[PDB]
Structure formats: C-alpha cells, structure tokens
C-alpha cells in the first residue's frame, strides 16, 4: 500500500507551511540590521 | 479554459488557463495552487513533453484536455 | 504495468534542507536581535523632523563605482534639525516606519 | 573521495569528502587546513556559485572534480 | 645538431634537434626522457630567459650549446 509513502510526503507540507510563515519575519530582521 | 491535470501521485485537479498561456506559466500556477517548485514538474500532453515556452495552441491543447505530471529531475 | 516507488527517491531530498532551515533561521534571530539591542545605547540626542521627501533614482547608472544611496533608493527620505542647530539630511530613515512621522 | 580545489594564487589543495557532506563542511575543512574563516571564502563550480543548504552529491560533484576558491574582498 | 642541458643536479642531457624547433617541443622532450612536468621548467641561456612561443633559430643557438634548466618553485 502507498499510504505510508503519502505519510512521508506529508512532511513537505508540514515544513513548507512553516517557512511560508517565517519568511516574512526574517526579511525584516535582516533589513533592520542592514540599516 | 478548464483542463484536467493528473499527477502520478493520483490526484486530479481542474485548472483555468488560456490557450496562449505558456507551459512554464502553467507550472507557475500549479506552484501557486500546490506549491510544488516548477523545476520538479514535467508536463506531458498526448504522451509528449511540453516545452515551457510553448503555449496550448502550439501543442494544440483543446477544450478540457488532460496533462500528466511527472516528478522529473529538476534543473540545478 | 507494475508500479514502483521511484517518486520518493526525488521527493525526499528537500526534507534534509528544510528541517535545518527552519531551525537555523530561528537560531539566527537570537544573535541578530541582540546585535541590534547592543547598538541601542540610551544616551540619544533629541531633535525635530523638518521634512519628508519623495526620492527617485538618477537617469544613469554605473558599475565598479556605484553608490547604494544616490540612485538605487526609492522610498521616503527625511530632513531633521538637531538641538545643537545642525541640519542633517538622512538617506535612510532607520528603525521607525515612515508612515507615522509628520513634520 | 578525493576532490581538488584551487585558488587565484596558484596554490592547490586536495580534500577528502563523502557525498553526503554539505558545503559548510567543506569550508570548515578549508579553515582547518589554512585558517581562512568560513564566512570569507566563496566557492565556485562549473561556473555557478556554491551555497550551503545542499549536499555535495546534489551538485553532482564527481570524483576528482576541481573547485575554485575566491576570497571576500572588503575595504573601508 | 646536439644540445647539452644542465640541471641543478648537474646531470647532462643530450638532445638531437633542429634550428626551427620550438621551446615547447624541447621542454616536452625533456618531459618524456626524465619525467619532469613541462610547465615547471624554465630555460636559461646566458642571461636571456627563453620564451615558449618562438623558435631556436630566432635565438641563433648553435651546436653543442650548454643550456641551463631552472625550477620555478611553487608555494605550499
């Protein structure tokens, strides 16, 4: 059965869902140092 | 216009595209919906690979045609 | 035809990247915020804003010798008056959002 | 494996690595070998820049390939 | 048309050549007959330093001339 294969596939969802969150913050953290 | 896109994962999705939209832009819109980076995407129509720069009209993709997604080697 | 699991052999590669990126960023924010903090020694001057200006890059460009600040700025800029009667132009506003300032 | 990395000076270095190593480990080995700090040095291969985030297999670094090292050039 | 080469060790090497040969060729002949890499060899003939791109008769070297090899050592 392919179910566990999609369970492993799940992790790419799990992580992209979090970096989509962080990337807006870390940009500002960089820029306010660059200034 | 509506097209079917069937992945080898087995999911099928309906996508609204124009006959003049490039295959690379279709990859961009899939990356919009699914997120999947386009470099991993190979789009096949009529068993033939679709060039990123070509359009539906160049491949003469008609109403409600189906594309197949292959997880290719990316470029990198 | 007989199926095969070849999908995972490509798919799985990204995990080793992203699991470390999500940790490395939330590591770096520690040092970065402290590096900002340790700059802010409180003996500030005080001063008044005189003007807010809209800025547009020049017509022509160069490399080997270009300035980040002459062209290649596009937002707001400010002109401030210090207490000790200096007047300074500022090319980069700094740690406050330009929206909330007024003369 | 063995890998050759050479510099703008004309000196050349040979490293031992396994395909699962990341770029950062390369730079760390270079620092161990020579004392350059890991943040200064830039690497080049096949005419495109290296970046951390990847294993040495990922760029298809083969046996006995050649890398270029070039230093950070800052003044003020 | 015989030529004598002297190395730092004082070993003498005999060469049968032609006035229209080139320094690249004689440097290669030495590479074949002793095993020294060509590009490490620098040739010295009295004061002049010989350049690869041109021919012996341009320097009017004569029969049985004695000619010095110098090694440009490299950093390490």
From Swiss-Prot, chain A:
Signal peptide range equals none
Location in or out of the cell: Cytoplasm; Nucleus
Q: Which family does it belong to?
A: Belongs to the AAA ATPase family.
Subunit note: Component of the 19S proteasome regulatory particle complex. The 26S proteasome consists of a 20S core particle (CP) and two 19S regulatory subunits (RP). The regulatory particle is made of a lid composed of 9 subunits, a base containing 6 ATPases including PSMC6 and few additional components. Interacts with PAAF1.
* Job of this protein: Component of the 26S proteasome, a multiprotein complex involved in the ATP-dependent degradation of ubiquitinated proteins. This complex plays a key role in the maintenance of protein homeostasis by removing misfolded or damaged proteins, which could impair cellular functions, and by removing proteins whose functions are no longer required. Therefore, the proteasome participates in numerous cellular processes, including cell cycle progression, apoptosis, or DNA damage repair.
- Report the protein name in the record: 26S proteasome regulatory subunit 10B
Task: Tell me what organism the protein belongs to.
Answer: Homo sapiens (Human)
Of the parent protein, the shown chain spans 15 to 49 of 389
Curated annotation (Swiss-Prot), chains B, D, E:
Q: How is it modified after translation?
A: Phosphorylated ubiquitin specifically binds and activates parkin (PRKN), triggering mitophagy. Phosphorylation does not affect E1-mediated E2 charging of ubiquitin but affects discharging of E2 enzymes to form polyubiquitin chains. It also affects deubiquitination by deubiquitinase enzymes such as USP30. Mono-ADP-ribosylated at the C-terminus by PARP9, a component of the PPAR9-DTX3L complex. ADP-ribosylation requires processing by E1 and E2 enzymes and prevents ubiquitin conjugation to substrates such as histones.
Domain of life (superkingdom): Eukaryota
Q: How does it sit in the membrane?
A: Peripheral membrane protein
Could you tell me which residue ranges the Ubiquitin-like domain spans? Answer: 1-76
Question: Where does it live in the cell?
Answer: Cytoplasm; Nucleus; Mitochondrion outer membrane
**What does it do?**
Exists either covalently attached to another protein, or free (unanchored). When covalently bound, it is conjugated to target proteins via an isopeptide bond either as a monomer (monoubiquitin), a polymer linked via different Lys residues of the ubiquitin (polyubiquitin chains) or a linear polymer linked via the initiator Met of the ubiquitin (linear polyubiquitin chains).
Q: What is this protein called?
A: Ubiquitin
Organism whose genome encodes this protein: Homo sapiens (Human)
Which lineage? Eukaryota, Metazoa, Chordata, Craniata, Vertebrata
Curated annotation (Swiss-Prot), chain C:
Give the subcellular location.
Cytoplasm; Nucleus
Superkingdom in the source lineage: Eukaryota
State the post-translational modifications.
Answer: Sumoylated by UBE2I in response to MEKK1-mediated stimuli.
Which positions are tagged coiled coil?
none
- Disease link: Deafness, cataract, impaired intellectual development, and polyneuropathy: An autosomal recessive disease characterized by early onset of deafness, cataract, severe developmental delay, and severely impaired intellectual development. Patients later develop polyneuropathy of the lower extremities, associated with depigmentation of the hair in that area.
Q: How does it assemble?
A: Component of the 19S proteasome regulatory particle complex. The 26S proteasome consists of a 20S core particle (CP) and two 19S regulatory subunits (RP). The regulatory particle is made of a lid composed of 9 subunits, a base containing 6 ATPases including PSMC3 and few additional components. Interacts with PAAF1. (Microbial infection) Interacts with HIV-1 Tat.
Name the protein family.
Belongs to the AAA ATPase family.
- Provide the function of this protein: Component of the 26S proteasome, a multiprotein complex involved in the ATP-dependent degradation of ubiquitinated proteins. This complex plays a key role in the maintenance of protein homeostasis by removing misfolded or damaged proteins, which could impair cellular functions, and by removing proteins whose functions are no longer required. Therefore, the proteasome participates in numerous cellular processes, including cell cycle progression, apoptosis, or DNA damage repair.
Q: What is this protein called?
A: 26S proteasome regulatory subunit 6A
State the taxonomy lineage. Answer: Eukaryota, Metazoa, Chordata, Craniata, Vertebrata
The gene is: PSMC3
Q: Span within the entire protein?
A: 45 to 147 of 439
């Amino acid at each position: 059965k392919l179910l566990e294969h999609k369970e492993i596939d799940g992790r790419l969802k799990e992580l992209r869902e979090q970096l989509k969150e962080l990337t807006k913050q870390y940009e500002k953290s960089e820029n306010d140092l660059k200034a | 216009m509506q097209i079917f896109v069937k992945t080898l994962t087995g999911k099928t999705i309906t996508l609204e595209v124009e006959p003049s939209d490039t295959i690379e832009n279709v990859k961009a819109k899939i990356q919009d919906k699914e997120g999947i980076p386009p470099d991993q995407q190979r789009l096949i129509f009529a068993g033939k690979q679709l060039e990123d720069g070509r359009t539906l009209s160049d491949y003469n993709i008609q109403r409600e045609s189906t594309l197949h997604l292959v997880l290719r080697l990316r470029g990198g | 035809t007989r199926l095969l699991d070849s999908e995972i052999k490509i798919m799985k590669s990204e995990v080793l990247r992203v699991t470390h990126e999500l940790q490395a960023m939330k590591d770096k924010i520690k040092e970065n915020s402290e590096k900002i903090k340790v700059n802010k020694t409180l003996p500030y001057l005080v001063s008044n804003v005189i003007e807010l200006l809209d800025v547009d890059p020049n017509d022509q460009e160069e490399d080997g010798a270009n300035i980040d600040l002459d062209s290649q700025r596009k937002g707001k800029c400010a002109v401030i008056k210090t207490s000790t009667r200096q007047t300074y132009f500022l090319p980069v506003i700094g740690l406050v959002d330009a929206e909330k300032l007024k003369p």
